[PDB]
């Protein structure tokens, strides 16, 4: 299974559990496998978070996925390579004020260590739209510049909060505990966010990729290309054009979802 994954992300480097390999893997993964919620949008739950199910979808079938699928898959890969992987749970606070109601635990991230590491590293390749394209030092206060935006971790209560410089200000993305969460808890969270009528992944369409000094973000029919210099926004004309963008620009095997007419009609009723 390891080979199939490495070919999918077009990785060619060494496979020893080191910092450089972790960097190169995260970079290759985020540039190759899109974030998408086509399953929950089409009424297909994300329930099965085993190595076999995630590799079947994200590698063999050339589909994307969301946080549970992305960090699930890379978590299994890193474990096989010799990294120590702990799975964590998070609450998403992006664009919300500090007095917003407590969000559900619907995000999952990884705490990663390896032979000779000075400290633990945060790995998150599943936070569609703003996922860090580098492993980040799991330490507070330090500004950590990536290939795209800079990131910063801060101590918030009994846990931590990940922040990123978006446009002109520091934005809180998600807060999380560093306590290990059992697989079953992650399944419960993934079920909620993929099946609940109020979930943004059920009511709408979201897709995201990086290629390579730019972010390609899609919210329904609204396509945004974020570069270091600025941002360009494209209003997609119809549901048919949205599907084309998902297949071409985002590299998703849209045929896997089923008949294109059904996907177009779902996008038409939801986004238009
Ligand atoms: N799939 N996990 C996620 N859960 N809630 C909100 C999110 C917002 C952006 C990206 C991923 C998210
Ligand atoms: N470097 N500061 C930055 N701040 N906001 C957005 C960015 C997007 C791409 C690259 C850099 C960015």
The structural domains of the chain, with segments of one domain joined by +, span: 1-82+183-272, 83-182
Q: Is 226 annotated as a binding residue?
A: yes
Structure tokens at 30: 């985020």
Residue 9, classified by CB atoms within 10 Å of its CB into exposed (0-12), middle (13-18) or buried (19+), is buried
Residue 72, φ and ψ in degrees, nearest 5: -65, -55
Question: Are 159 and 46 a contacting pair, CB within 8 Å?
Answer: no
Strand order through the sheet with 150-156: 136-137, 121-123, 105-113, 84-92, 169-176, 159-166, 150-156, 143-145
Catalytic status, residue 67 = yes
d(CA 202, CA 40): 5
User: Nearest ligand to the C-alpha of residue 199?
Assistant: 1
Strand spans (E) along the chain:
35-36, 84-92, 105-113, 121-123, 136-137, 143-145, 150-156, 159-166, 169-176, 206-210, 214-219, 222-227, 231-235
d(CA 260, CA 164): 37
CA 96 from centroid of its chain's CA atoms: 19
In a mutational test of the pocket of ligand 1, which residue from 46, 67, 191 has the highest number of ligand atoms less than 8 Å from its CB? 67
Q: Which is the catalytic residue, given 67, 154, 212, 268?
A: 67
Q: Is 200 helix (H, G, I), strand (E, B) or coil?
A: helix
The length of the chain in residues reads: 272
Catalytic status, residue 107 = yes
Q: Which is the catalytic residue, given 29, 39, 70, 107?
A: 107
In a mutational test of the pocket of ligand 2, which residue from 146, 149, 164 has the highest number of ligand atoms less than 8 Å from its CB? 149
Ligand 2 shell residues, CB under 6 Å: 148-150, 165-167, 226, 228
Q: Is 233 annotated as a binding residue?
A: yes
Which top CATH class is 1-82+183-272? alpha beta
Longest dimension (CA), the chain: 53
Q: How far is the CA of 131 from the centre of ligand 2 (A)?
A: 13
Question: Are 254 and 220 a contacting pair, CB within 8 Å?
Answer: no
Residue 126, classified by CB atoms within 10 Å of its CB into exposed (0-12), middle (13-18) or buried (19+), is buried
Kindly indicate whether the domain formed by 83-182 is annotated with CATH number 2.70.98.60.
Answer: no
Q: How far is the CA of 219 from the centre of ligand 1 (A)?
A: 13
Beta strands at 136-137 and 143-145: parallel, antiparallel or unpaired: unpaired
Experimental method: X-ray
């Amino acid at each position: 299974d390891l080979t199939g994954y490495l070919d999918r992300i077009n990785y060619r480097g060494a496979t020893d559990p080191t910092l450089d390999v972790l960097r190169d893997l995260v970079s290759a993964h985020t540039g190759a496998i899109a974030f998408e919620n086509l399953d929950p949008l089409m009424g297909v739950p994300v329930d099965d978070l085993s190595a076999e199910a995630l590799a079947d979808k994200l590698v063999d079938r050339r589909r994307g996925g969301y946080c549970y699928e992305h960090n699930g898959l890379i978590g299994y890969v890193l474990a096989e390579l010799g990294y120590r992987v702990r799975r964590l749970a998070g609450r998403v606070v992006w664009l919300a004020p500090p007095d917003a109601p407590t969000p559900a635990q619907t995000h999952t991230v990884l705490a990663v260590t390896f032979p000779g590491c000075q400290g633990p590293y945060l790995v998150d390749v599943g936070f569609g739209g703003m996922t860090p394209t580098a492993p980040l030092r799991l330490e507070t206060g330090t500004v950590q510049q990536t290939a795209l935006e800079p990131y910063r971790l801060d101590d918030r209560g009994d846990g931590l909060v990940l922040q990123a410089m978006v446009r002109d200000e520091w934005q809180a993305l998600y807060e999380f505990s560093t306590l290990t969460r059992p697989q079953v808890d992650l399944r419960v969270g993934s079920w909620f966010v993929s099946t609940h009528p109020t979930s943004h992944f059920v009511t709408g369409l979201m897709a995201a990729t990086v290629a390579d000094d730019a972010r390609w973000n899609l919210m329904g029919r609204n396509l945004a290309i974020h570069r270091r210099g600025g941002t360009e926004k494209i209003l997609l004309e119809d549901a048919a054009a949205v599907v084309d963008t998902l297949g071409d620009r985002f590299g998703i095997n849209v045929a896997d979802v089923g008949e294109r007419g059904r996907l177009e009609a779902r996008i038409d009723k939801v986004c238009f």
